[model samples]
Target chain A: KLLITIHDRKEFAKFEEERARAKWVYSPLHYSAR
Target chain B: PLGSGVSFFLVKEKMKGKNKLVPRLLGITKESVMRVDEKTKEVIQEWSLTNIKRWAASPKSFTLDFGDYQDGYYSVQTTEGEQIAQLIAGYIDIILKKKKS
Candidate 1:
């Protein structure tokens, strides 16, 4: 993913409200830094 | 920009697919901490890019082999070649609270 949008806790809760209308994928984030 | 070790086929292919043929290099200098067979405490080794140059181009490129330095493990390489030797040296300050199984 080249870009990612982050949401605050409050904003995230609002997003959950519309989760039923959208497809969301959840996974752990891990990257090895150079 | 391509070879074994760090500079493998995958890295080379990725760089070439970008249509860019260039090398990106990074260097690092730090105090390394390591445990030896007989040492009571961890040994510290002064690591620097300057000294690492001596070890560069040793039969191979884009790879640094410290041999068996008490300091620790360090390897330097580059994008197209062994240019930027990232964080070569960094003393990890850790407290030994206790040793347990």
Candidate 2:
């Protein structure tokens, strides 16, 4: 079987939508410098 | 780009017309992810971070999705699957940030 598109939520929805979202945390120390 | 990379022998789990858990070297670097030939050190194929639509895994079985490619995806069994997935994600994230800054 080739890598074909199959729009099945069961297959990829969890990883792509939910788990793969990137988030960044703001930190004052990292943001500031002398 | 400044980072580390890993090249490991991943047994092909799911791929086009391939079986026998074909051993292929998966090379992940800060720039690109590639499928390499272990013996000859030849690059079989590569994927840019931008082209990668999504990447995730079911434990050690990692999968990559390239939304606009003839070979849309590939899966392999690697102990470092999670790291590979995250590393690709980190690179993608960095690329997007660079466009703004």
Candidate 3:
């Protein structure tokens, strides 16, 4: 589990979308900031 | 271009193959989050690059929200072989919320 401080939500969303399509080794999950 | 301010976060592998040998000389930072038991001092919940479907590496920083985790201490790490950040999940929430506000 890695902790990343996202500076831009919109940019991160796009990045996350791409990652979602890409292959992963384990289950991916996300939580709200607060 | 890769140094102090530059950090790397683990990402899903784009290719299928055996994990490649990452150079130790290069300074790269990989990030992850985990939960720990206060009394037993055991890790409770942890989500890291290993949790991903494949072994991969990417040069990017990510946002890991501690919202879904239980109210307890969580630790952060990087492939650089060091624990960079550690704090209570609640405190993490406060800091993030402050940033947004």
Candidate 4:
């Protein structure tokens, strides 16, 4: 998986909400199926 | 059917002590959703990150996630604005076919 490293608060704020949901996001066996 | 695709997602993190915005690279097969307007019965220009799956890759440059649905393409140019070693699906296909011959 990709690892995005944010160094700024503004940047972190931008991703805060998405990151929360991302925690619950999962991948399927393959992109085609999912 | 060969139905497989790779996507990338850009997230931010807080370090112990660091200043300035540095876009680190990460990958994912992710898609975001914009606002849906009942009047138009369509998606508005507004975009937000919804479901996202991470991909594996190294950071290229200072990356930022606008969190807008319009930013739908996954690449160094659109997101990271840098040259990355990773190749897209079409490019990868070309490389693989050439090797087969």
Worst 10 residues of 2 chain A by lDDT: A22-31
lDDT of 3 at B56: 22
Error of 3 at B35 (Å): 4.2
Model 2, residue B63: distance off in Å is 0.9
lDDT comparing candidate 2 with the true structure: 0.56
Steric overlap count per candidate: 8, 0, 18, 13
How high is the lDDT of residue B60 in model 2? 41
The digit string of per-residue lDDT tens for model 1 on B1-101 reads 52233212111111324322222222232322121222342323334322332233211223444433425423322233323222222111121122111
Clash pairs (backbone) in predicted model 1: B23-B80, B25-B83, B25-B84, B26-B84, B26-B85, B28-B88, B30-B89, B30-B90
| Tens digit of per-residue lDDT, candidate 4, span A1-34 | 9545653455445444333332221223124351
Q: Highest DockQ, which number?
A: 3
Candidate 4 — number of clashing residue pairs?
13
> Which runs of model 4 end up more than 4 angstroms from their true locations?
A1-8, A16-34, B1-16, B23-87
**What tens digits encode model 3's per-residue C-alpha lDDT throughout B41-61?**
554555643222222222232
Candidate 3 regions with alpha-carbon error over 4 angstroms: A1-7, A21-34, B1-42, B46-53, B61-101
Task: Give the RMSD in angstroms, all C-alphas superposed, for model 1.
Answer: 20.4
The docking quality of candidate 4, as DockQ, is 0.07
Candidate 4 chain A — worst ten consecutive residues by lDDT sum?
A21-30
lDDT, candidate 2, B1-101, per-residue tens:
65454645464443356323445677777676777886788988877656566566655456566666746456555556566666666765676577643
Model 4 lDDT tens row, B1-101: 73276443343323446533433334322233233333454534432233223332333222223322334423221243223223322333454456542
Q: Give the alpha carbon lDDT tens digit for every residue of A1-34 in model 3.
A: 9544563344445544543343322122233344
Summarize candidate 1's per-residue lDDT along A1-34 as a digit string, tens digits: 5543463333333333332333221111111233
